A paper describes a structure:
CRISPR-Cas systems are prokaryotic adaptive immune systems and phages use anti-CRISPR proteins (Acrs) to counteract these systems. In the type I-F system, after pre-crRNA is transcribed, Cas6f processes the pre-crRNA into small crRNAs, binds it, and further assembles with one Cas8f, one Cas5f, and six Cas7f proteins to generate the crRNA-guided surveillance complex (Csy complex). AcrIF24 targets the Cas7f subunits by engaging up to five Cas7f subunits (Cas7.2f-7.6 f), sterically blocks access to the crRNA guide by the complementary target DNA, and induces non-sequence-specific DNA binding to the Csy complex. AcrIF24 forms a homodimer and further induces dimerization of the Csy complex.
Author numbering:
A (entry chain Q), B (entry chain R): 6 to 338
C (entry chain V): 2 to 76
D (entry chain L): 3 to 223, 239 to 322
E (entry chain V): 153 to 228
F (entry chain K): 11 to 434
Amino acid sequence: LSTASVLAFERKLDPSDALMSAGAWAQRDASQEWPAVTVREKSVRGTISNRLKTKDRDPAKLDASIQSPNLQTVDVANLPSDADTLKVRFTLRVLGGAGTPSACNDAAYRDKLLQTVATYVNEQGFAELARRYAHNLANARFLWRNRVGAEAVEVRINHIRQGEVARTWRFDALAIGLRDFKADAELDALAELIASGLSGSGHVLLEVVAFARIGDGQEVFPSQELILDKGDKKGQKSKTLYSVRDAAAIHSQKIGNALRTIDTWYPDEDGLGPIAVEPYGSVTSQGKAYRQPKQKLDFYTLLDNWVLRDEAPAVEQQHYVIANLIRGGVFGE
Amino acid sequence: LSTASVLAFERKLDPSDALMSAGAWAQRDASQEWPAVTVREKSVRGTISNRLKTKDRDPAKLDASIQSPNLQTVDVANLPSDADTLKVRFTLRVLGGAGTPSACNDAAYRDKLLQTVATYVNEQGFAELARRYAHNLANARFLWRNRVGAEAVEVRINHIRQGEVARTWRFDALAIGLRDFKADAELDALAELIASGLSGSGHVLLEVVAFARIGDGQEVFPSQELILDKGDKKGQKSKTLYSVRDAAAIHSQKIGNALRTIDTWYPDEDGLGPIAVEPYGSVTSQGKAYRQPKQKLDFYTLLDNWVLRDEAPAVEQQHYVIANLIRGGVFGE
Amino acid sequence: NAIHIGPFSITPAARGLHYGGLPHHQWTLYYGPREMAIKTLPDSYTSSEVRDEFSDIIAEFVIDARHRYAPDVLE
Amino acid sequence: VTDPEALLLLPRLSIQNANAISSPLTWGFPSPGAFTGFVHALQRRVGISLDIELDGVGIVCHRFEAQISQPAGKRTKVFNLTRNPLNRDGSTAAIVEEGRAHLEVSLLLGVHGDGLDDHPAQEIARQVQEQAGAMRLAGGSILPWCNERFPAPNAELLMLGGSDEQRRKNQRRLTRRLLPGFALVSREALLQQHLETLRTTLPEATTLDALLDLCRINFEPWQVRDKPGWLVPIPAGYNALSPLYLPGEVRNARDRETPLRFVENLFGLGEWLSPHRVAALSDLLWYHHAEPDKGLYRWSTPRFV
Amino acid sequence: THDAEEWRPPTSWELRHVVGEGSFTGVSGAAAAALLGMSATNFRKYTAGDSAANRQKISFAAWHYLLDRLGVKRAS
Amino acid sequence: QELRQFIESFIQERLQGKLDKLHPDEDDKRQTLLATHRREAWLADAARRVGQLQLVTHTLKPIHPDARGSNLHSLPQAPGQPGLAGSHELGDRLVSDVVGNAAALDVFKFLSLQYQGKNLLNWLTEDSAEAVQALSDNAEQAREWRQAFIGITAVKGAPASHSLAKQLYFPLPGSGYHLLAPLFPTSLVHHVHALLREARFGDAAKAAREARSRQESWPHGFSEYPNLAIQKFGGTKPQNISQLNSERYGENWLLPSLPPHWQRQDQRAPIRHSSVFEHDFGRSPEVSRLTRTLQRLLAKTRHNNFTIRRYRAQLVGQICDEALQYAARLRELEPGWSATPGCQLHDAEQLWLDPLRAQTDETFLQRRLRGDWPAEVGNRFANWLNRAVSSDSQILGSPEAAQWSQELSKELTMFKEILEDERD
């Protein structure tokens, strides 16, 4: 028995693109006609602040570069000067059936994988993973830089069963930390709902709204697009922000990456905090791979030991492997 | 007698390119002014996630490969943030005269083929194949990934004889499963209609409209385009979605592949579900061909045993080869 | 490996990226201190290909400088 | 060679997944041989059974939508393909490229037989519509009826019937339903004129059909040399590279009751022009004629200017 | 300028406007050396860029005569 | 006979090429096998892989992935139809492909290795009297070389179509049908591929593209081919059929045969603020380019005016036809013909771009909503044409200016007649 050549998992926990709007605090219960945050342009004169080559650290050349500074046009998004609260809204569906791949070659490999995931569900439920997903929904970690330095963050989560709201959760997202996973009654109810969605025992659709009290006219941080070339035929535009129709927005993969920031079992440390579950679990902001394949704790070696050679790892690493299965991906040769 | 050197069957059950639109649930009766789902672009940044070679474990090399960012431009398609229902519409025309090939070199072979298919219709009608086709129209199997995890799928079929509608069918596509084939009076009446269209006793035209209740702003899945690579050139957009006049669309052959998923008589198993009908019946997702020619159950040897050698196969295999006749093909040496 | 076309200089960005799976680098075209253009060109581009990627912007600069600083005409 | 007694208008035919390549040199609109084959197959299927003969096609192309893409670093274009099913060993297929497109075209068909004599015009037009709404035009399916409820019925218009001023007025009211598109004609005489005025420099013929239909940029005597209309390359027809063959002597023929030949493609110049620029609506009819003593299997539109 | 009290010699970047295969005159360094009656190496000494790497500045008469011979300034 | 003196040197060069990868154990046997057909015994190599793989100037390969048939290379002339082009006169180096699966391209190289300046490569296929000295040996090697050369370019004779060979019916004059199997014109597409590579690339085209990038002069123009599509052959191994080289890796590029309007499925020109008031703003790139090209023609010829005036009249008629087509395209995308802000030209633009009869423009609006107002639309079109084509004061001093004025008046009269006939 060997691993399959092609094997692909569709993602559970599908989020939508998060849209931004603005308003006043204590009007957030009437926050349905809040106007969208618009992306504008402004001019930026760039100073000289890079490291010099020290083959160009001559003072005359430095003053000649400082005398002629360069200029760009930059997309920017701010709150209005009379509004102090950013509202960020998206929808998230929890589907279930996380073990079954959407593509396979070997029938024996997918049968062995299916009974391995079935035994994982039979030993314990999705309660740990859904508890950590409900935690990452409870604190507004999906507000990436909009959460930083906020005065007060409040998350409203609505389980939407028919076309109307079935249940309502209210979380103080700064009380729920970004570090440790506490225990709370409403949070455990939300975790049980997400676990019932992940086990295929229901169809879960949630509307998540987050209110961050940032300040009047302050800069918000939508998702940022990609610029390949730049010239004088444009406005020398060097920064482009993402936008659905006419609204500052966050990419759905950004919300998804902040959702699965649950991995606290990486072998390097645990005092840093959770990272996102990835094969060779890596942080782009740190440029480093936790769970190196030299150690026996990346996703591929753990999965091949669990399925092929029946070496079931520790229950923390079992949570990690099943979280990687929930994340989805292309796994194979 | 021998098989003809040329043999060419025109396809019946011609579908249209299924166009997507969006709206709210309980407005689906007035879903004629629903705006189209458009295709946008966005930017993705990912990490190293695939399997590494054993010579490339090398943690310094992995950290070096992480620190080079991986960016793509991706075509995406979403619902609007105030619409939760995807409406997919296509037209399907049934022609009849399924026995006659569009080309045959041998006249005696085509006369034996015509009397063989005439005796096949004389023994029993198209009602098994027509009932399975009405099943694949009843459950929304043409919603390929748009049906996965949907809340409520509902299919409307309009038989249009003259310039107005002749008859309507209303189906709950989630009640009718994708595994087994039921019997229902509306479904059997629709089966009688597709059977009478297949028998040359008329020309049937249907308009099929499926409403899936996905969620606000969620991602839909139209067809993907084929771009052969410009290898020694710049990096390309690594996803392209099919669109007809700025409307997200599924290919005609994708709906046609979804319609003929009727084959439950392949010798490998019967619990995995129906597959599409083709000679050497092979599904691209599994990467493996059922109805191998080393067994005498593929289409070609069954056709040669029925026509040339007068060995009439079993009635489910007669259904299989007749469904391959409706599907069409270019058969020959 | 900068490229010098008269008073113009095209320099790479000292660390590449991966666009579409392929490795790329940002090339900046300067006219002295004035930054004229930036493009994202892949690796395995020869210096000739980098040259006539920016030849059109150089030609537009030449047309504009030839029309702007044209001498006077007496009739 | 035959002036039609009346004209039928296939009003707005929508076509999906039609062939775009249609030739080893061009890729745009399909060849007019497909439209002549369509009207001959329509004559076979419903034309014979009504004491009607059909002769030629006028085509106007209301809209075009090619399934192509530009590969992001080049000014050329590539074709969009489809995923064929796997082979018998389940490995992969052999990628053979095909070019699909979407068309909106009208058809102008001439009739000579007992048109208004045995049957009225409306029932003839309606059953030709019902017949043509069950087949395919150029490799792609005739897209059936959608929420275009307006443009359904045809107009069997008598060509020479009525007063001559009334003839111009009814052909103008028929051209009123064909203004969105631009008709297609053959331009063999303009090809020959440019060929003779080019042959003062060099005696070559395919270099002309190259140089007729590009953007010729002549230097400072920076200008662009231009033709007054829309000059396109078209497949001019079929020229046999082999003699006549009997039905039985060639293996793997389509029919052992029809004589065969090996042929090559003749390429020529066509023209897209506004339909108001031609005063007689019977000028646009594309006839195919055979000269089987030699290889000339030609489609054109004679009696056009 | 023609006034030698206010004239300063061109830098290497200003010299590359007129001399070089990418320059606006399209005149190489060998042809510009042959216009001034020099060798290619002594003229390439002008086109180094920094005063340390064996670079001297062009003279008033040679610069104005070169602008005369390239057809840039009339320099009567 | 060159095989005794110069073909010995050619076989020695081939032996040095085959012995460049020469080793002691296997490469020694490879050098021995090369020297067995290196001095005068090349007829053994021609018996091996010289006549077993032959092809014609039009291979039946690209008609399918694998279609059994004989790619005949006949038909050197067919100038019957004097309105078409193709293989009627190839003439200038009609190349041929090695149709088949023979990897022994050394025979195809040796067919031209002694072909230039020697009668061995040209007479080896037939009339091998120079092949008597071309063998450089006795009658056995010369007979083997002549047999291989005859078997190289030998026709298949017995015809074979396929299912994957595009068999087509063509109707006869008042009788039955004929079956037709087109071959892929490999020599013709290679000739036009060489012509398109000479047009698109090459140093003369590069120099002319530089001399048009700036506005300087060069005593010849150049060529640009927009919308060239690419078609690939076979796949990752583009040598299942020959004449498909390394750079020509199945590369068959096709010239455009497009209708005039390729895009803009959405209504690009609505009755907007900046356009509903000024209906003659000309929201179109092709119409604007045609107007700029018509306005650029302003000089007068002493003997070219007799055709230049007719060309300008044809250009003005094409501009009027494009205006009528733009009116039709606007009329195709007007479900609700409703007036909005900035539509102040709605007396003329809303009348000439009038949709189907609404409730507000009823029979009671038979002069307001249902009014046939082609005179004001013709006046606005004539004003837009006079702004685009401002005639000189002495432009009518020759007959070209009076002819242009008469052509503009006749085109405005034809547009007014089409608008009045279409005005209800």
